[PDB]
Symmetry: C3
Subunit: 210 residues, 3 copies
């Protein structure tokens, strides 16, 4: 009986020792888990144009502007040469309309217009305004987005080159256009004289950022 009690006491002391070892290991774990819980990269999110899908972070790229070939580079979208007819509308120095043959070269988010006319435009003053509304294109191109300027571009007048024949002589002017809305721009240019007169063989060259 004395040996029972004394032996059990030694066993208890050994158990105490094990419990303290577990106690210490618990504290080390608690410190380690506290440290892990403070990890800065935990909870990261990504704002457009960055995005995550199934743990893969990507840069979302507009193919008319940029692409990747390992590094971020310029546009991958195919260029187009659009060909259509556009009835331009004279105002402010003309009441007439003129049918323009238009080639629109769309490359990246730049669209360059090259236009020439058949027929003529009667003018009454030394300056005329000519309006280009997308609704007046004879057979609207499918890719309409390429003919609409960006919000940034729309905010300013932009240069337009014009040439035409008046009294069997060709005149040419550095002129300007401006968008009155996303679908409509108007150009203003000298007519090469005063009074009622006719100009023909009108060419318009300009370009826009889309």
């Amino acid at each position: 009986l004395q040996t029972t009690v004394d032996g059990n006491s030694t066993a208890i002391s050994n158990l105490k020792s094990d419990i303290s070892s577990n106690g210490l290991a618990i504290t080390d774990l608690q410190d380690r888990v506290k440290s892990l819980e403070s990890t800065a990269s935990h909870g990261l999110s990504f704002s457009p144009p960055l995005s995550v899908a199934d743990g893969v972070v990507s840069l979302d790229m507009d193919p008319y502007f940029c692409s990747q070939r390992v590094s971020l580079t310029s546009y991958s979208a195919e260029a187009q040469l659009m060909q259509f007819r556009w009835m331009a509308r004279g105002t402010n120095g003309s009441s007439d309309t003129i049918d323009m043959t238009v080639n629109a070269h769309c490359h990246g988010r730049r669209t360059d217009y090259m236009m020439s006319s058949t027929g003529n435009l009667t003018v009454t003053s030394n300056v005329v305004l000519l309006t280009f509304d997308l609704s007046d294109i004879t057979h609207i191109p499918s890719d309409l987005a390429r003919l609409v300027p960006s919000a940034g571009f729309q905010a300013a007048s932009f240069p337009v080159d014009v040439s035409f024949t008046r009294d069997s002589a060709t005149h040419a002017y550095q002129a300007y256009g401006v968008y009155s809305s996303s679908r409509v721009f108007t150009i203003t240019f000298p007519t090469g004289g005063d009074g009622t007169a006719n100009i023909r063989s009108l060419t318009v060259r300009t370009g826009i950022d889309t």
Copy 2:
């Protein structure tokens, strides 16, 4: 019996350890669920030694804190290029070419002092990179992008014919990455000679 008290005390400590273990298990299971553990990066994003970068083509873009336009130096290349009549001419003509490369835009300004014999009212004139002998060091600035190659593109031409100037808004098209052909009116019909050909155009590379 003194032993019984010691046993009762040990039980309480074991139970305390158990509770702390359960708390740790819950916290570690929470840590294992952390959404950011699974993260990788797709080009043009890349990671090296824990640093995540945007890899940038210096001909297109750069950083000055924010992502901005190209840092690559522009170049004004000057060289001669033999162009080849390929329809409406079987003649050739040596062009003096200035190529202004700025970012991924390359603008051509060409002129000639020679003569081109043409046989019809339209001529096709071909520009193959192989016909540049004194090549510049960055020949990739003369190669259009895949996207740009997909369409015809505007070319202005001017020349003299029978002592008269002619100028036309004309078009070119790449038949391959190294070759484009311009198509333009010759200013008349039959066999004739045109002089002082100027060509102005540009490409996106």
Copy 3:
């Protein structure tokens, strides 16, 4: 013997706790190895309060879900620039300048007021920002990028001399970030006056 049973029971629970601890140590070691810990982000990527962004120059690019071209408003600046003859002229000439700033491109359309006295067959004409009257607020739009400044660039010029028009494909080059000089033929020799000078060029900013 009774406390012997109780000691066996305590032993079993202590053992269970130790094994639970070993498993937690393995899981925590694994968590400590997590590759995504300590990720950082290099310009133009940045992080603020755990949100990772692409910092975008609004004159170059923007996002509309995807990374796209500039959002900044275009501007048509109008000002007077007094250009200075720096070879083949010691004269000055006042230019009316429209600068069309769209994204990081600035296109100049200039027309002259008055006559420029030239002395030779080529003139150099200098455009220093200090000579602009009523300097725009966004002066940054008139300063070429470091990349652009590295090369000469095309400039179109036209003017009148002795009642005849002349027009040349010419070139300019920046001597410093604030100053460029254009070089062009004057259409003759000796002392003369040219008028109605127009200049058209563009720069990447």
